[PDB]
């Protein structure tokens, strides 16, 4: 695959890690968000599925101060809140 158009706050996140376009696949969106979390070291060092997004644009995007990478449906749901799906 689907093409998506990130809303502005997600766009700013994507761009802070090198993405320069306005339309993405979900795969690109997940890759860049992954890069954002890794590069900013937002994950718990001991339990690396835990991500802290408070005090960060990611927390404003997601609306939660923390989440677990294992929470697949919650992650996608949060991402979709911040995307318009093409078509």
């Amino acid at each position: 695959e689907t093409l998506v158009r990130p809303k502005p706050l997600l766009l700013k996140l994507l761009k802070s890690v090198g993405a320069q376009k306005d339309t993405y696949t979900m795969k690109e969106v997940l890759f860049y968000l992954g890069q954002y979390i890794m590069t900013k070291r937002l994950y718990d060092e001991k339990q690396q599925h835990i991500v802290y997004c408070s005090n960060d644009l990611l927390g404003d995007l997601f609306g939660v101060p923390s989440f677990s990478v294992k929470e697949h449906r919650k992650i996608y749901t949060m991402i979709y809140r911040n995307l318009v799906v093409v078509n």
């Binding site: 997940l30 979390i37 690396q48 599925h49 990478v69 294992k70």
Partner: peptide, 11 residues
């Protein structure tokens, strides 16, 4: 289990 390993299961 590394962050990278976890992130991959999302795909």
């Amino acid at each position: 289990l590394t962050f990278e390993h976890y992130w991959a299961q999302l795909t």
